[PDB]
């Protein structure tokens, strides 16, 4: 009945799956089929989409150094996760985590969905700021259903062409 | 926007706070009106009530050890929290967190409850192990409505016996 396992050590944990918290993988859910949707988060990665998270973030970056590039205000902002810092995010503020680090490690911890809850991922242009394009998805297991969404937006210059300034954003990079 | 504020330093938040991680009040919330309750819980401290979570619990042991007393599979079972542990607790397993050691701190998230779905606290008879009293509590802060919850339970020999044998629960020790 102890569903999820004994406790363990987290940091060995940690360095045992060292090859998964790099490219291509990154990431790493540390239960199945939980509530609480346990993630630890490597790098090196770098991405241009935002996410819109329906509900609330935890974070805690507990190897290297990390960073959220935000939407608050309006306006453009970066939220810096030093090592050792946590950080807990409102539910809807736009994301796009930034992981410069090799050897880095991140603890991420969200919440399953409802159903009926729904995940947004949009771009935004770096010419005029205006949103590109968004996709609503509901978030059933994220290393699933995001690749193949990440992929046709950057495999079309039609989701990826601003509809204020015309410019085409660049998509991965 | 960022209504829970910046990223922060979480080893020097748990200096800047420890003599709140101790008695009498011995844990402490991270961050205000939040969905995911987050907690630094420190030491020492024991105590016999067992909690009945409708949803799930996760612990991170970052300084010191410390041991959940359990029932699973109808059997008293204890798991350690070694320093360095993490541990999800499924729901409704019922848990009692010993800390006997000073200046230890564990992480421990859990959400909040939407209405109707309630928390039981419940204590044991050490001579027959039959359930000798529940409380179920719409749970909104910890630290205002379980506080009295416990008092009366102590104070009250009723409360106290057990149906089975009749032996009447030390209570607080
Ligand atoms: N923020 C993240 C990250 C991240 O921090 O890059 C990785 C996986 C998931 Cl599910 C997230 O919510
Ligand atoms: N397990 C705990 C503890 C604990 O681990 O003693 C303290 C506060 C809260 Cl709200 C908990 O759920
Ligand atoms: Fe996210
Ligand atoms: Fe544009
Ligand atoms: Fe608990
Ligand atoms: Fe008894």
Known sequence: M??????????????????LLKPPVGNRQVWQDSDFIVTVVGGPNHRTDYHD????????????????????????????????????????????PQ??????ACLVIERQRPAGMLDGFEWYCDACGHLV???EVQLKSAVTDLPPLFESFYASEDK??????????????
Chains 1, 2 share one sequence.
């Open 2 to 19: 102890l569903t999820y396992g004994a406790p363990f050590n987290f940091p060995r944990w940690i360095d045992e799956h060292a090859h």
């Open 53 to 96: 998270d329906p509900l609330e973030e935890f974070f805690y970056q507990l190897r290297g150094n990390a960073y959220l590039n935000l939407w608050v205000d309006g306006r453009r902002e970066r939220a810096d996760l030093k090592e050792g810092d946590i950080f807990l995010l409102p539910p809807h503020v736009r994301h796009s």
């Open 99 to 104: 992981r410069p680090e090799a050897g880095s």
């Open 133 to 135: 394009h968004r996709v």
């Open 160 to 173: 990826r062409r601003c509809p204020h300034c015309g410019q085409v954003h660049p998509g991965r990079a």
